[PDB]
Amino acid sequence: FXXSXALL
């Protein structure tokens, strides 16, 4: 969840 892991 929350995108790819780049930002979150």
Q: Output the six-digit token pair for 6.
A: 């780049």
Residue at 5: amino acid letter: X
Task: Say how far apart CA 7 and CA 3 lie, in whole Å.
Answer: 7
Q: Output the six-digit token pair for 3.
A: 């995108």
Q: Output the six-digit token pair for 7.
A: 């930002």
**Ordered DSSP codes for 1-8:** --SSSS--
* SS3 call for 7: coil
Q: For the chain, how are helix, strand and coil distributed in percent, rounded to 5?
A: 0, 0, 100
Method: X-ray
Task: Say how far apart CA 7 and CA 5 lie, in whole Å.
Answer: 6
Contacts of 8 (CB under 8 A, 6+ apart): 2
State this model's resolution in angstroms. 1.1
Task: Say how far apart CA 1 and CA 7 lie, in whole Å.
Answer: 11
